[PDB]
Amino acid sequence: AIIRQRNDEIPTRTLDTAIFTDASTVASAQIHLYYNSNIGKIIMSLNGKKHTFNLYDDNDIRTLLPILLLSK
Amino acid sequence: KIPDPIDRLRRANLACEDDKLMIYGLPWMTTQTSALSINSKPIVYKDCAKLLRSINGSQPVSLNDVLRR
């Protein structure tokens, strides 16, 4: 409101998805996401560890999008 | 405008070209690009097409469809 509501565009609930740990290896995963719309960053919590993705960096975008798009 | 960085990703969607997992629907690319694993390698998976359909069925799924849940 405005930034606050922008941050709420990404769900806060658990996401059940699939993650490719290598080029040819995939496994089920449950994750949480946080979004900071001021600078365009998403933080993902996976196996108790933090991962960050810069939404202005094409390589991060290509890594994050398959995780979101395979979620149920 | 002050942009919402998510907006330019809302039409993104996955597709299998043989065993290669690709990302369609990104406006600034004039060509499709490969999806990357968590260790930064292009995803190549023998059961690619069956994995996609296991998740969504036959219905196509964009990022916008994910965000409206």
Author numbering:
A (entry chain A): 40 to 111
B (entry chain B): 60 to 128
Direct quotes from the study:
Unlike most other members of enveloped viruses that utilize one or a limited number of viral proteins for entry, poxvirus encodes four (A26, A27, D8 and H3, protein names refer to VACV) and another eleven proteins (A16, A21, A28, F9, G3, G9, H2, J5, L1, L5 and O3, protein names refer to VACV) to mediate attachment and membrane fusion, respectively. For the eleven fusion associated proteins, they are proposed to assemble into a large machinery, called the entry-fusion complex (EFC). In this study, we carried out structural characterization on VACV G3 and L5 proteins.
Eventually, we solved the sub-complex structures at 1.8-Å (for P21 space group) and 1.5-Å (for P31 space group) resolutions using the single-wavelength anomalous dispersion method, respectively. Because protein terminus residues are much better traced in the electron density map for the structure with the P21 space group than the structure with the P31 space group, description of the structural elements below is based on the P21 structure unless otherwise specified. The complex structure, within the crystallographic asymmetric unit, contains G3 (amino acids A40-K111) and L5 (residues K60-R128) in single 1:1 binding mode. As can be viewed from the overall structure, G3 and L5, with good shape complementarity, are stacked together to form a globular fold. G3 consists of four anti-parallel β-strands (β1-β4) and two α-helices (α1-α2), assembling into a compact structure (Figure 1(F,G)). L5 is composed of three anti-parallel β-strands (β1’-β3’), two α-helices (α1’-α2’) and one 310 helix (η1’) (Figure 1(F,G)). One conserved disulfide bond is observed between C75 in β1’-strand and C107 in α1’-helix to stabilize the structure. On the whole, large surface areas are buried in the sub-complex, which are calculated to be ∼1606 Å2 for G3 and ∼1553 Å2 for L5, respectively. In comparison to the other two patches, the third patch therefore shows the best overall structural complementarity, the largest number of participating amino acids, and the most diverse types of inter-chain contacts (van der Waals, hydrophobic interactions and hydrogen bonds). Taken together, a total of 15 residues in G3 and 18 amino acids in L5 are positioned along the binding interface, providing extended inter-molecule interactions for sub-complex formation (Figure 1(M,N)).
